């Protein structure tokens, strides 16, 4: 306990350092901007293929193809424009909690309770989708996997550690230790040199992909963080937690900027995404309705109540055209 | 209009028929979640049913396909992945009877049982409780007393009464006696009668589920 004391000293120093910077809250600065409150989006498409709970969905960089992960053991790539199914991948493990779509579009990744991030090659000389390589160095369930390139994927796990992988070799080049709880989500920076992680210790950590160490730690929340997403600028991010609160943290200021919580909401947040300009915060909820938040004024500008079951995943296209929400009712909807 | 988007739709409808045929094939198998805190007979019973991460086990008995998921090699927060098993037909929970005096270890089994039995994800999910190592329990109970696990135990130190006491202390941990049933069995090296017990419990659960789908229940 000799050096446990200096941990409180450094915590007080950091708290004072970020207290001094908090001269004016974001809410005061946004008392002049025009509010948006008429955000009403309607279900343009309903993807009906899955026969079980949908745990993860990921949009393609083309804003048209999306990959969907469900517990029927199927990974489905959808044509959001025509509702068509491009591919239906049979997974070895049906307990998949995450799915990523490669920015190039040539691969999809799938992980879950099998502790393996499986890479699937979508574009082969044959016509089938084949397992490119199974990444099996994690000890807990994989909660999130995000592609940095065709050869680099960063995965979060229930082993409390995030890992950076080299796909063609299959070895985790860099491991990211420092959390004390199961890491539940990942969000790559737009430049793909940083990433934030949200774990069950109610803390978010900013990591350096190249360096391998965490530069910042954010601990506004009270319960475990289930969702994390960077602001489109890359300088901020928003976290969703079982606390029923969404927070906004700014890396440069290094603290919480705004809190998105309402009294009518007791359920936690399963997924968080930002609009293309970052003005809207799309958060998934266990009340069966997604909630659009004015990210600058922290007001509920809209509700997406089209799901009869808990929303688990939601994502916005790179074009910003539509927001897709997946839910445990087995249905994935595209909202515009 | 559709030029070759007419053939993408044909593919989208050909890989939508396989999803139905895989969902029909996957919904005809009983899904069992195998649990148990620390050292128990779960590894032992998995041998009795004729088969890191989830150890999925397949076995068929009396034309009924089973799919057992062992989550033992998963050290994480159960709250973050226990909801993945919400639609299991039944939970198989293994408790080692010989752990009453060990390290205390029997009380940990009760904490794990209470956490899952009253879990909001399993309110109707029945539990097949396996009180394993009944042979070691009877050998040990003559010398070591059950008082070392339960201070408030008013009874004799014999196997057939203390075992019933253990079954009562585990079967009274549920607060949902109306909506779900616990099937308890004592097993040490049972000659393939554990599969019979699981089959009977699963058949009762399937019948009760078929009644709930109808209005009879």
């Amino acid at each position, epitope marked *: 306990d000799q050096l446990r004391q200096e941990a409180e000293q450094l915590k007080n120093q950091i708290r004072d350092a970020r207290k001094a910077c908090a001269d004016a809250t974001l809410s005061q600065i946004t008392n002049n901007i025009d509010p948006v409150g008429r955000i009403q989006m309607r279900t343009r498409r309903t993807l009906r293929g899955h026969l079980a709970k949908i745990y993860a969905m990921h949009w393609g960089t083309d804003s*048209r*193809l999306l990959v969907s992960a469900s517990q029927d053991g199927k990974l489905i790539i959808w*044509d959001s424009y*025509t509702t*068509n199914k*491009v*591919h239906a991948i049979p997974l070895r493990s049906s307990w998949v909690m995450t799915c990523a779509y490669a920015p190039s*579009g040539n691969y999809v990744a799938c992980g879950g309770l099998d502790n393996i991030c499986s890479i699937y090659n979508l*574009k082969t*000389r*044959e*016509g*089938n989708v084949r397992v490119s390589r199974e990444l099996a160095g994690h000890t807990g369930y994989l909660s999130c996997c995000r592609f940095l390139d065709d050869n680099q994927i960063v995965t979060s796990s229930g082993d409390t550690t995030c890992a950076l992988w080299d796909i063609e070799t299959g070895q985790q080049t860099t491991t990211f230790t420092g959390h004390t709880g199961d890491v539940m989500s990942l969000s790559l920076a737009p430049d793909t040199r940083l990433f934030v992680s949200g774990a069950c210790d109610a803390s978010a950590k900013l990591w350096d992909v190249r360096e391998g160490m965490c530069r910042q730690t954010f601990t506004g929340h009270e319960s475990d963080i289930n969702a994390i997403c960077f602001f489109p600028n890359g300088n901020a991010f928003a976290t969703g937690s079982d606390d029923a609160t969404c927070r906004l943290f700014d890396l440069r200021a290094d603290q919480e900027l705004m809190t998105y919580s309402h009294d009518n909401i007791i359920c936690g947040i399963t997924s968080v995404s930002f609009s293309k300009s970052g003005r809207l915060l799309l958060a998934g909820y266990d009340d069966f309705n997604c909630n659009v938040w004015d990210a600058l004024k922290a007001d509920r500008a809209g509700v997406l109540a089209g799901h009869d079951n808990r929303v688990s995943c939601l994502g916005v296209t790179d074009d910003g055209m539509a927001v897709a929400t997946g839910s445990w009712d087995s249905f994935l909807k595209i909202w515009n | *209009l559709s*030029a*070759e*988007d*007419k*053939a*993408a739709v*044909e*593919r*989208s409808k*050909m890989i939508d028929r396989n999803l139905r045929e895989d969902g029909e094939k996957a919904a005809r198998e009983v899904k069992l979640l195998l649990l148990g805190a620390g050292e128990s007979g779960k590894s032992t019973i998995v041998k009795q049913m004729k088969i890191t991460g989830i150890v999925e086990t397949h076995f068929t008995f009396k034309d009924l396909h089973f799919k057992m998921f062992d989550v033992g090699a998963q050290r994480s927060e159960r709250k973050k992945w226990i909801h993945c098993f919400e639609g299991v037909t039944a939970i198989i929970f293994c408790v080692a009877l010989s752990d009453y005096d060990l390290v205390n270890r029997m009380h940990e089994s009760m904490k794990l049982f209470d956490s899952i039995c009253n879990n909001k994800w399993f309110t109707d999910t029945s539990i097949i409780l396996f009180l394993n190592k009944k042979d070691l329990f009877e050998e040990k109970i003559k010398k070591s007393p059950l008082t070392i696990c339960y201070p408030e135990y008013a009874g004799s130190n014999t196997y057939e009464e203390a075992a019933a006491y253990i079954q009562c202390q585990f079967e009274d941990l549920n607060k949902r006696k109306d909506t779900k049933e616990i099937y308890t069995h004592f097993t040490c090296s049972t000659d393939t009668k554990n599969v019979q017990f699981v089959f009977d419990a699963v058949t009762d659960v399937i019948i009760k589920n078929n009644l709930k789908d109808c209005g009879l229940f």
Partner: single-chain antibody
Amino acid sequence: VQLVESGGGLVQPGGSRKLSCSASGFAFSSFGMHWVRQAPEKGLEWVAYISSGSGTIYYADTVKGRFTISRDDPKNTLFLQMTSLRSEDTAMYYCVRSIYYYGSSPFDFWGQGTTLTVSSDIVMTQATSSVPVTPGESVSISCRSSKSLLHSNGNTYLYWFLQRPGQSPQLLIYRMSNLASGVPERFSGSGSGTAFTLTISRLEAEDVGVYYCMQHLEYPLTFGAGTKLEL
């Protein structure tokens, strides 16, 4: 991926023959399959097609009724049953695979072919038939479509094939803009619904051959007369 045709030979005019396409190295059941024949010293003509799952079958008007196309997915083979054969059915029949989904490259792989020696349509016209070129020049092959190939979905259904001397055709540009896997970046495609262009930048010795257009907007799939480059 290998597509091997068999069943070709000389037939008296009026007889019957069955063509086989032994397909190995790819998921045959997931690929729609085509038969494209080439009359000797002449251009490509599409004769038949089976969708993946066998649900959709189309035939060329010339062979419709007297030609039958079937596949056996477990046996990984494609069959063309030919009856009432005439003198103008003598051609090298190519077996072609095509997979249809968003972003796919249909007609990507062509079989070797087998020779028979029997003793409205979106007309596609190649303006030229021979083009003298040098190994350093940049030829721009032209193509003309009777009906506009641009669709409401935004896709222009024009494919570019290169058939080298004594070889099967290879897809170079599918949907007139993006080049097929395995093709050098020198090839490029452009066009505006009609009047399409295939631009080659550094014409190597392996670019010499006959270039064929094909429309995939409507069946039957019509090919161009073919533009040849001589070295």
